[PDB]
Amino acid sequence: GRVIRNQRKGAGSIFTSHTRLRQGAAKLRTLDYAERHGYIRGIVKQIVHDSGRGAPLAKVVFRDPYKYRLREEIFIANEGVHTGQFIYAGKKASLNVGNVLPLGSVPEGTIVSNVEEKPGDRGALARASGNYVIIIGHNPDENKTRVRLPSGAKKVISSDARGVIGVIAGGGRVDKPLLKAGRAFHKYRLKRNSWPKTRGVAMNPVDHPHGGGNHQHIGKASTISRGAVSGQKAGLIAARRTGLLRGSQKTQ
RNA sequence: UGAUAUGAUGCCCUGACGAGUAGGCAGGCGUGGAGGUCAGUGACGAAGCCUAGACCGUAAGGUCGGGUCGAACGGCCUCUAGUGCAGAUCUUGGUGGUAGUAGCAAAUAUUCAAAUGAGAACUUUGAAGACUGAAGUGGGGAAAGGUUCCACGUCAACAGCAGUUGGACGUGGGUUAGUCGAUCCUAAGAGAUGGGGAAGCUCCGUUUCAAAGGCCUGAUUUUAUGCAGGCCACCAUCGAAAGGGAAUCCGGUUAAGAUUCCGGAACCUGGAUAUGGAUUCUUCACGGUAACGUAACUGAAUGUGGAGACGUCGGCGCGAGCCCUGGGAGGAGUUAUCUUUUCUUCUUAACAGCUUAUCACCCCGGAAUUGGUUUAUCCGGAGAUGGGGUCUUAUGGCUGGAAGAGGCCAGCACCUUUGCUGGCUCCGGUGCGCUUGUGACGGCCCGUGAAAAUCCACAGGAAGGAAUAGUUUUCAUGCCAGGUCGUACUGAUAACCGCAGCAGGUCUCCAAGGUGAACAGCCUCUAGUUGAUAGAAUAAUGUAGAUAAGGGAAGUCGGCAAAAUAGAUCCGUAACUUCGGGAUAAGGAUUGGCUCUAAGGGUCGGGUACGAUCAACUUAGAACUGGUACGGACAAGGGGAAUCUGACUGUCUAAUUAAAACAUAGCAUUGCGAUGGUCAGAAAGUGAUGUUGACGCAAUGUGAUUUCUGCCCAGUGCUCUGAAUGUCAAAGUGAAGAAAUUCAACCAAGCGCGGGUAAACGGCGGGAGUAACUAUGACUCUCUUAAGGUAGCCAAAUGCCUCGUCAUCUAAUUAGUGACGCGCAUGAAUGGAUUAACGAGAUUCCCACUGUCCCUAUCUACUAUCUAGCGAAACCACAGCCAAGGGAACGGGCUUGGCAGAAUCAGCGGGGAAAGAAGACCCUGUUGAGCUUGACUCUAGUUUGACAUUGUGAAGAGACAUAGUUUCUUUACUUAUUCAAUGAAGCGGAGCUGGAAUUCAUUUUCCACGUUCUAGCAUUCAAGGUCCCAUUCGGGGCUGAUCCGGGUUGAAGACAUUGUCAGGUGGGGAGUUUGGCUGGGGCGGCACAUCUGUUAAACGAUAACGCAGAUGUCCUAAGGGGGGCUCAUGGAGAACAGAAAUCUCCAGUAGAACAAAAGGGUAAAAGCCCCCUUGAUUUUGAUUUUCAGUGUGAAUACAAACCAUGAAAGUGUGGCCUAUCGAUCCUUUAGUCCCUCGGAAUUUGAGGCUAGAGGUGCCAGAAAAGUUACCACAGGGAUAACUGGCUUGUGGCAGUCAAGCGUUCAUAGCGACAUUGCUUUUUGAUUCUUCGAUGUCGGCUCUUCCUAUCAUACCGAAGCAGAAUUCGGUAAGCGUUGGAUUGUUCACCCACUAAUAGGGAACGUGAGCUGGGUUUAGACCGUCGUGAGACAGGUUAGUUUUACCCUACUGAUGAAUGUUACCGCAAUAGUAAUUGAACUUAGUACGAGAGGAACAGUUCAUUCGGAUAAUUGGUUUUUGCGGCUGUCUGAUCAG
């Protein structure tokens, strides 16, 4: 039979990201002298819409400490930051929405976005519109910090790892119904070519494990093992449970 | 054999015999080349070819003559082979019949004359009639073509008639650029390089782990370019003739080029530069409060800003061109009449000067009584309204360019080149106009709508600069230069692609007048066409366009097709609904022309109420008027009530399916925190998601809203912080051994155990009883499950029965709808129920409408048809008249008959089982392929373990058995390895100063140790300070800025990773397989290896899915020997004792027993009881059955042993006889201690030899699952489905006997028990014909035939009074209908009728139709299946080809029987009429009555037929008369 749809995506032909209009990668400043000893000041020169993104970017310019020139950065904008505002980044820096501080330097309950996984990676976690992470504790010996990510997971990372105070802007985007095919259409038009989706059960056997039969139906359990091999994994992969989730979610 | 004559395989005598497919052999014929020979033939004619001329041979063949021909060739003995054609849907080439045939019919359309020419329907010119109608048949380009462009010459081929013409042929000519494109830049993307993979062709990477490069000027005055600074670390390149982008215009000009040439007038870029002006003694300009002004007005490094540079729609404002229009100055048209009229010319480029703007901004001022203000509600104390100013120059105005150009006229000149002279080219108006441009605003987004080259600016101030004369080329003027390639033309019903001059396809710009909402249709101007074979007629049948009286879907599967409707204004508008809709719902009125009335606007002066003038179709109202017409052509929705179904818009099977299928929003579930999830790759320092981060990416399901989503985790999956002594690999460990090796324990993941999980796959019971008639069963019991279908919903697209029952709609309904529900087999995101709105979706009814029909008729155009020119194809064994017969069971040919007369034209669809393809169906084949799965066999990947990469400490266990070599567990180290970051920038350690801190002698320490009201500024090794050079202008050192170690900063760490084996997992993928016989195949059975009896026809042998049965075992005795005894059964007898217990006698041929099927066999046995036993053993041959006289099984008689038993003779080599079973390779055991391990030995081990065991039951013996309707190939009429043939059980029809029925009475009418038949529209049985194809059911149409007669004519019977009916005869002459439901045949109802008989003709009839059903490919549901898929279940959508031949049939001509004409005969063939009612007979005959006829007479009618057109009706190109819309001819007339 045929190579199924989820196998063809990895070869990246018509499936690569539609990148032309994007403002450029959002990152924190490089972690340098200023940021790990002192603080350094910047101005948000603009806050701007990035294509295929939920949340606005903020263009933030700084002075180059080692050379006379301006150096401009692209930040994900936290809700409430504004044009003309001064941004402070460094180990010793006041605790205010929009500033970037090492996770060690903020008290528990602090709310931060675009937080680094390792120190220096210029931010990894909690970048999507509406999201943040909460600092749930410190271990000053071995200087770690325990945080809770948007997924509900709780991870422990270096207290040197930087984050930015506040939550990411443009929240509530997903509360509004798309209402029609076209709105979805233009949505994925600026992301990648994932839409619309043919059901495997509407296909012929060559095309898909679910394909075929004189009635539409899966024909065997749609829960597939991790051990499964490419061309086998479609449906519910490695599911530990299945069915309507009753009762409260929200991990203890 | 006898020479001296010619064949010894010869010659001579004699007898018998002669069929032949497949096949064997023999003797001969013929061909290309080879050795030999005849000193062969031949230019005085070789070879070849032609020849109803000759001769030899049974024949293959040979020889000659004659004709034609021109260079070579043959006989004989031998050699040799690419050696002999009728076939192969054979190969290549050539040629016929078809046939002068099909045809050359789309795109409105042509005509008169002249010229030219051999020749003119077709060329050229003039005229006329039309067309395209600015959404072009106009004017240009992009792709593509490549000379097609232009001129001259010219018609052999080509342009499906023609040709003097051409995109043809021949010969030439033609494409001019600083400014138009390319060129330059960057887009998706492509791709070198240091590198890393790969055996390698090469793959990866593109700034990526790399010592990656070049500018500005200074230093030179050996001199040419070394070094002195300071930068810049930007790191290839290719990629747009529609993106970005330096700069040109107008007039003229060619056969053909032009933003390219000529003329004039500009502009850009680069290089040079000098004069003028500006600037400076206050050096680097002034002015303005400000916005900002300008002719100028130095400015390096570095930095920063801007331009390039950006969506879409909406109304509003403005510009340009076009459109409309007044006056005048010209030219043209019309003028019987009318029109101060109709048409036309009246123009102004780039570039330059001055000037011109919405927005924005500045100054004055200080606002509620809030004001300003847009079509659109936005603005103001963060300063409105007001007054005054500043800016952009889109754009317009005036002038320069520039009237000298161009346009339009008049007046002269003349073979020419061709002039010459004049005049005029002027001033206005209007706008919801049209196209296009642009501005200020507004709407929209989970969409917010490129990049780079390049240009300018500002911040900075390095530096360079004047008074006796410096600075300036962003001000003016001046000089030089601007290369390479493309440039023609077409751009399409003839220049491109479709084999072509093909009705197809193929990107785009410009766009006039009327009607009108309009870029619609229809008519016109400019421009362009007038191309498409032609002539004559107007039969049938057609294609395309129209109309029909009365009826109105009765037609049909179905209203298919057609008709009806329609614009606009006004009135009026239901259920239901998500409140948005439904809605143009539905239903109505009105509409011309002409003549009036009213309302709706602009602009200017008013001291600090109005007047005057000019320019626009809209809306309403009112009269008049007409053959009551008026959206007058054109243009333009049918509507309503329901069911099924998908929410909607959207999507697909190019070329049979547009749908209910796919998608969608919404709903739900799953995986993943980057050392990751999913996915790519041979590999990798590789890749997609990713410019990403859970409001995310990836993976499934369901399918908008509302409502609701029950129970089941036993199974299959998936999953788990679970269990643990069950299973379990390689390495490692232990034991035994001389080792090879053998055995053991330990043991990873996995398995097994346990838990979770259904919006995972999926599932969601059976049986009894029970309430005061019957019924029903709330209730009970009972089996059983993982749970036993909940809410809902239904004969539903899901119900077999089924055309379910009830109701409703109809005259009548297998239809529809509403109900009912023990529902074969409804049911919950396998989603259930509901649902407004929407649908080229399936279905039902209603209104309107109608030629769908009753039932047909008529008209137009183009065909067909006849002519000239032009001219194919399919197909073809030979051919073409029938009836019967037989025959491969449906003949054109054969047999017997009927018959039979040249040559032919138009038609036609009976036949040619016509043509189109080696049957798609069905079976066979040791033939495939797509697909699926716990089929067989593997595999990429993945997981798990071991070893290697692999090093350093310390603590803890483990051994020589409580010194430290070593091995593990734990946790530390960092240099291997791994990850991240950065133009490797501030790391680690110490020291300064502070200070929290309390001092238990002094610091024991720990934090620090230049930046946080503000949308400024931060750069020249840094100013400062200090020391130098020998004071120059410049320049250096140190400090400012603390020391020290050169580890770029982190993460990770001997773990990951990688490499080699090992176990798990692995339809993701690979490969393969998935019995036979068979009254087709399949299910079944076993007739597949066998045994008994019979079939079997008295030796033997013998078939069928023949008949009645049996076999894969059973037995230490049920085997062997010996002795004794006699059985089955019956009678008569004996306490309890009975039909049956145990005892006795008599009779007893086997009537019993001998494992088993049956049949043989047996009585001092072969049966039953007892005694002793292992011969059921050892060796190797022969034989019988089956047979090939192979094997296997089974058996027989001996030989050579050792034994058993009996007194003994004997008997015993398994079971009394006839069935009870198994090759080769391999493993295993027994045997002798025998052979071999090949350099020699010993010992293990291995290998041989003989005999057994492990098994093939498809039994002479492969290792093997499905599906295909997506399907394929080789074949089969050895083989099914359809016609036809034989049969006639079954079906149907008819008899004989006569017991009964019929009040009585067998036979009026019937008729049992029996029995004899016929028929071939029943259904079976068969398998003969067709599988290189004989098109399926039904209906429509139409003809003919049969009779077993429904009606109609004439009769005979009756349980015949009349009337009605029944039975029978001669009878097929004549008729046998209209509808509702169903695809139906059939069935069933309504209704009419004289009657509504049954049948055949390839189950008549598809080149006759139709295509509803069946039966390909799409799709929904039910049932089944794990699945692919299946269903003889339900449902929807699904390309119907060719006639010109022969014959038949219908009509139509016609040679020749001397010529020609007229009038006639009649052989043969055809033939036609049919049924009813009324009046009267007659209220009669007959009858108790009720009732109740007929003949003759008369008048009408039905069905059919042949004519005819006085009448009535239909038809209209009589385009005959009239009327009407729109436009065109100036008006009128007339068109």
Ligand SMILES: C=C1[C@@H](O)C[C@H]2C(C)(C)C[C@H](Cl)C[C@]2(C)[C@H]1C[C@H](O)[C@H]1CC(=O)NC1=O
């Ligand atoms: C398939 C087989 C094995 O799988 C099992 C085997 C036993 C049953 C163990 C013994 C018999 Cl006796 C033979 C056979 C059935 C064997 C037969 C196989 O065709 C042999 C026979 C031969 O010669 N070459 C083979 O290849």
Ligand SMILES: [Mg+2]
């Ligand atoms: Mg990309």
Ligand SMILES: [Mg+2]
């Ligand atoms: Mg897509």
Ligand SMILES: [Mg+2]
């Ligand atoms: Mg989906």
Ligand SMILES: [Mg+2]
């Ligand atoms: Mg989908």
Ligand SMILES: [Mg+2]
């Ligand atoms: Mg499908």
Ligand SMILES: [Mg+2]
């Ligand atoms: Mg599959």
Ligand SMILES: [Mg+2]
């Ligand atoms: Mg599967």
Ligand SMILES: [Mg+2]
């Ligand atoms: Mg399936």
Ligand SMILES: [Mg+2]
């Ligand atoms: Mg399904």
Ligand SMILES: [Mg+2]
């Ligand atoms: Mg002979």
Ligand SMILES: [Mg+2]
């Ligand atoms: Mg002769």
Ligand SMILES: [Mg+2]
């Ligand atoms: Mg000759």
Ligand SMILES: [Mg+2]
């Ligand atoms: Mg010659």
Ligand SMILES: [Mg+2]
């Ligand atoms: Mg020879």
Ligand SMILES: [Mg+2]
């Ligand atoms: Mg040859």
